[PDB]
Nucleic acid binder design. Structure first.
Ligand SMILES: [Mn+2]
Ligand SMILES: [Mn+2]
Ligand SMILES: [Zn+2]
Ligand SMILES: [Zn+2]
Ligand SMILES: [Zn+2]
Ligand SMILES: [Zn+2]
Lengths: 543, 545
RNA sequence: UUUUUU
RNA sequence: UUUUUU
C-alpha cells in the first residue's frame, strides 16, 4: 500500500525558509519556497535559502507548486530555487503572485508559469493530488490555507494564520472557519499548523482593535506623527490611512520598501488611500498636526527611514521635541538591541515615543493558543505535524493538542529533511533526505559556508596580525595589525623579536620555508598570549 | 555665589552598568561604588568595561573615602582597576559586600585596601562636609543599602538598587527601611537619586516569597531529577530553594565555579544556611532521580557555564535525559535573548521538561516597578530628582512617573555620565562636564583595545579580508590571501590578481610613489569585487616588494 | 539588568 | 517572526 510522503525541506524546527514537499508515487507537489534571515553568529551574510538536493534529484516528478502567501519566509527563496528546476505550474493568490513576479524579474527569470487562483478553487496536480484553497487571516492579504486531497486521505494545512474576526479594512475578510469545520467532519487525516505563538496564552488581538488604539493615540498628538510598521502589513497601513484622513492628516509613505508594497497592494485592490499620498516636501507646507509619515525600519535597521531619523542623518526630515514616533511593531527575536538603540536615540531627541506593551499598537499575524485550539478542535485530525516554529514552539503546540477533548492519535515533531510517512493508520518518520541551509552573501550563493563563518567569528573576537618574515639578507620579521590592539611600540618590537628568534633556531639549522612558519607561529602565539592574554589570528608570510 | 555640592556621575547614568558617582563639596570628595559593565554585541571580543577615572586621578588628594552599596558586579566589578590607580582611602560597606570585594582584590593581588564594615543605621563621616547614613533596601543580593548623604547644602537620599519586597522568604526578618525613608521625607530630602531600571513596568515587582511558593509547587510535582539555574548571587532565591528542597526530600548539588563562590561568601556572612550539607554530583548519583536537585550556573545562556554544557551534551560528569526537569529561574537580560533561546531549544530537543517565565512565574526582578518607585517618591517628597541606573528611556519614564504624583519634584534632570550636577538649597542644574566614558578590558589588556580596534573587528566579522601584496620583481605579479571571505575558488582568485596587476603595471607605466600605487590597486580591486561579488571585503594592500 | 570561567 | 536597502 503506497503511502504519502511529507518531506519538509525548510521551516520545521525554525522560523523561516518554509518549503514542504508532498510525494505520492512518482508525483510531487511543493509548497512555498521561503528565505530565512541570518542570526547573529552568521555574520556578514544577507539571507539563507533551502538546500534543494532532493528536488534536483526528483525534478522530473514535480507536478506543481503552491504559494500560500507573499511573506519573504515563504517566497524569498524562489528566485534561487526556480532557476535550477523545470518550469512547473505555480499557483497562488493575486498579491502573492504580484510580489513573486516582481522578484523574478529582478533576477531576470523568464517564463515562470505563474497561475492565479482564489479561495475555493480546486487545483489538480497529476493523478494523485487535488488542492483546495481557503481563506485564513494573517498579517498580509491574499493568505491561504489549503486542503490537499490524496489517495490516503486529506491533509489540511492552516498556512501561517491568526483568527482575526475583523481586520478593520471593511473588505469583509475573514478566515473560512466554516470550510475548516466541514473538513473536520469530512475527515482530516493530517493537520499541519502554525506554531509561531504556541507558547502565548489567550487570543491574538484584532487589527480592528489596534486601529482603534492607534486612532485614539494619534487623535491626541499635538504635532507631527511618525509611525513605523512592516511595509507588508497592508491591513495595518490601510487602517492608518483611514484614521489619518478622519483625523485631518495627510500621509507620506517613506522608505523604498514601503512604496514597493503600497504599489503591489494597490494594484491588487488591497490598498485604497482615501487621499493621495504626499511627499515630505509637500507636507512641509502643512501645520505639524496635519502630518503623518508611515516609515520603514520597524526592526531597527539603521539605514531604514526610522533609523536615519533617530540618528539625525535623514536628508530631508529632522525629528524634534513635540514629534510623536509610534513603533507599530514588536522586535523580532535577535533585533532587540537594534530597536532599543533607536528607542533610546528617540528619547534623547525628545520626541514622544509610543510602543508596546505600554501602548497596544501591535497585533501579531499569528494565532495564539486559543486560536490554535480552535483549529485543532474543528479539524479533529488523526495525525498532527506542528509546523512553522522552533522545537520549543512545535513541542508546546503538541502539548496544547493534548489538553483538548479529542487529541490526535499521534503527533510528530518533524525536522527538515525528515521523510514523514502518511497512511490511513500510519504516521512515522521513515527516513531522511538531504536538507539544510545555503548562504547568500552579496551576489554569491553558497560561496560562504560554515567554515568561512568560523573564520569571521575568530577575526571578530581576536583580531589579526600579518607577519612577513624574511631570511634575506639576515633573518627578520615585519608586522601589519588589524583589530588586535592599539599601536604599541613596546609590544610591536617584542613580537618581531619572538618571530626573529624563532627563525634563528630555524636559520642556524637548515630550514625549509614551510617548517619555519609553524615554529615562529608557535613563538608568537606563546608570546602574544603571554603579553596580552589574547589569541589573535596570525597569517605568516615569506617573500 | 554660595558653595555648591557637585554630583558627578562617572558611570551608571544613561546606561545600566559600571555605576560610580562622585560627590564633591569644596576640596572634599566621596565616591559611591565602582562597577563594571558588560559588553554589547558590537563590542566584539572584549571581556568587560570599566569607567574612565580621569576625574578621580586629577583630584585624587581630595578623595575622603568610598561607599559600597552592594556586591553586584555593576557596582563593585571595577574596583580592582580603580583602586590600583588611586590612594588608599577608607572603603565602607556591609559584610557580604566587603567579603566579595575582599576576594576580588585578593585575586588581583591588591594589598592594604582599607575595607571598613558597616551595618544598617551606621553613620560614617568623610572629612568636614559629609556624613553618610546607611539603611536597608531589599534587592536581589543581601546586604544591600541605600544611604542618606548629609551635606552643607542639605540631604541627598540615594535609594541604591532596590525593590520593595515585603518578604524575601528566608525567615530572617529582612525588609526595606521605609520608616527611615519616610522620616527622611519629613526631615527634608533636597535631592533624590533613584533606581530607574524597571520604570517602564506598571504595578509592583513580585515577592521572592511568591516565587519560592511557585518553585515548591513545581518541584513537588517533578517526577525525576530537577536542574535549576539562577544568578549565583541570588542568595535569597537559592536559600529558599535549599529549604523547599529539604521539605521535598531532595538533596542539593551546587554546580559551577560561580555558584560555589557566592555560596561560600553567603555562608561566611550568615546569609546562606543549608538545612542539609551540599552533595557532589557523584554523591547524588547514589540517590533516586526524584531525590536530586542541581542548582547550576548559566542562567544567561553562557555556553561554558553548567547549564550550557548540559544543554549541548558536553558536561563531563552529568548527562541530561528525558524525564529531567530544567528550571530557568531568571529572565534573559537584554542582549542575551538569543543565547538563552539557543539553550532552551536544545533542552527541548533532549526531551527534558523546560520551565521558565512567563509560562511559569519562577523569577522576580531585583528592581522596583512603578508602584514601588512611586512609593519612594511619595515618601521622600524631594525638592530635586535624579533618575539613575537606567538608559535614557528608563530615566525619562521615571521622571514622567514623578510628574503624575501628588507632589512632583520642583525640577528633575536627566543626567549623563560626566555631567556636573550643581546642587544647592534652591539650585539644581548641569553646570559643565568632566571627562567620562568607557575603558575596555580584553584579556590582560586594559585600555589597549579601543573603538578604532573594535571597528576593525566589525569590518572583519562582516566582510572577511583580502590581503593583496604586489611583488615587483623579477616581473610584477600580485599575491592574494583571503580569510573568512569565501571558500576556495581559483577562477576568482586569478581575476582579482589581474585587476590588481594592471593597476600595478599601469601605475608603474606613469610614475608614482609606491604609496600611490598600492592605493590604485586597492581601488581597482574594490571596484572589481563589488561588481563581481557585491561584497566589500576588508582590503590590505602591500607593494613591498 | 548581572556574569560566567572543563 | 519579517526584511531593509543614503
Ligand atoms: Mn556580506
Ligand atoms: Mn577577548
Ligand atoms: Zn506569513
Ligand atoms: Zn511564515
Ligand atoms: Zn544590584
Ligand atoms: Zn546595579
Amino acid at each position: 500500500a503506497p503511502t504519502l510522503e511529507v518531506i519538509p525541506l525548510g521551516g520545521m524546527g525554525e522560523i523561516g525558509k518554509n518549503i514542504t514537499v508532498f510525494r505520492y508515487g512518482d508525483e510531487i507537489v511543493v509548497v512555498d519556497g521561503g528565505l530565512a534571515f541570518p542570526k547573529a553568529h552568521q555574520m556578514g551574510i544577507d539571507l539563507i535559502v533551502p538546500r534543494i538536493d532532493y528536488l534536483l534529484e526528483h525534478q522530473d516528478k514535480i507536478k506543481g507548486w503552491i504559494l500560500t502567501h507573499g511573506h519573504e519566509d515563504h517566497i524569498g527563496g524562489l528566485p534561487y530555487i526556480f532557476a535550477r528546476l523545470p518550469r512547473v505550474p505555480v499557483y497562488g493568490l493575486p498579491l502573492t503572485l504580484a510580489l513573486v513576479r516582481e522578484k523574478l524579474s529582478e533576477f531576470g527569470l523568464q517564463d515562470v508559469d505563474l497561475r492565479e487562483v482564489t479561495y475555493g478553487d480546486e487545483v489538480r496536480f497529476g493523478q494523485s493530488f487535488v488542492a483546495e484553497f481557503f481563506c485564513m487571516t494573517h498579517s498580509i492579504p491574499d493568505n491561504a490555507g489549503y486542503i490537499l486531497k490524496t489517495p490516503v486521505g486529506d491533509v489540511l494545512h492552516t498556512g501561517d494564520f491568526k483568527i482575526d474576526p475583523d481586520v478593520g479594512t471593511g473588505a469583509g475578510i475573514v478566515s473560512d472557519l466554516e470550510r475548516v469545520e466541514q473538513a473536520g467532519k469530512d475527515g482530516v487525516l493530517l493537520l499541519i499548523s502554525d506554531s509561531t505563538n504556541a507558547e502565548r496564552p489567550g487570543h491574538t488581538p484584532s487589527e480592528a482593535e489596534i486601529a482603534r488604539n492607534l486612532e485614539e493615540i494619534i487623535k491626541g498628538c499635538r504635532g507631527r506623527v511618525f509611525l513605523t510598521t512592516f511595509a507588508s502589513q497592508v491591513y495595518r497601513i490601510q487602517n492608518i490611512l483611514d484614521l489619518a484622513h478622519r483625523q485631518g492628516r495627510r500621509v507620506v509613505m517613506e522608505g523604498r520598501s514601503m512604496i514597493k508594497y503600497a504599489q503591489a497592494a494597490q494594484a491588487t485592490g488591497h490598498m485604497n488611500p482615501p487621499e493621495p499620498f504626499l511627499t515630505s516636501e509637500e507636507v512641509g507646507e502643512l501645520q505639524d498636526q496635519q502630518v503623518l509619515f508611515v516609515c520603514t525600519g520597524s526592526q531597527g535597521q539603521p539605514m531604514a527611514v526610522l533609523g536615519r531619523l533617530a540618528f539625525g542623518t535623514h536628508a530631508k526630515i529632522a525629528l524634534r521635541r513635540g514629534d510623536t514616533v509610534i513603533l507599530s511593531s514588536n522586535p523580532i527575536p535577535g533585533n532587540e538591541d537594534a530597536v532599543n538603540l533607536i528607542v533610546n536615540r528617540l528619547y534623547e531627541i525628545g520626541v514622544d515615543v509610543v510602543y508596546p506593551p505600554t501602548y497596544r499598537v501591535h497585533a501579531s499575524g499569528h494565532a495564539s493558543q486559543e486560536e490554535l485550539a480552535t483549529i485543532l478542535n474543528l479539524t479533529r485530525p488523526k495525525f498532527f505535524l506542528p509546523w512553522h516554529g522552533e522545537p520549543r514552539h512545535q513541542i508546546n503546540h503538541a502539548k496544547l493538542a493534548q489538553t483538548l477533548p479529542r487529541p490526535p492519535k499521534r503527533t510528530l515533531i518533524a525536522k527538515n529533511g525528515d521523510i514523514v510517512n502518511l497512511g490511513p493508520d500510519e504516521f512515522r518518520v521513515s527516513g531522511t533526505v538531504a536538507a539544510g541551509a545555503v548562504y547568500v552573501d552579496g551576489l554569491g550563493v553558497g560561496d560562504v559556508n560554515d567554515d568561512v563563518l568560523l573564520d569571521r567569528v575568530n577575526l571578530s573576537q581576536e583580531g589579526l596580525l600579518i607577519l612577513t618574515a624574511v631570511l634575506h639578507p639576515t633573518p627578520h620579521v615585519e608586522v601589519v595589525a588589524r583589530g588586535f590592539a592599539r599601536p604599541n611600540r613596546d609590544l610591536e618590537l617584542q613580537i618581531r623579536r619572538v618571530a626573529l628568534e624563532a627563525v634563528e633556531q630555524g636559520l642556524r639549522e637548515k630550514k625549509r620555508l614551510e617548517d619555519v612558519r609553524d615554529d615562529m607561529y608557535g613563538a608568537v602565539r606563546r608570546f602574544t598570549r603571554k603579553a596580552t592574554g589574547r589569541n589573535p589570528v596570525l597569517i605568516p608570510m615569506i617573500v
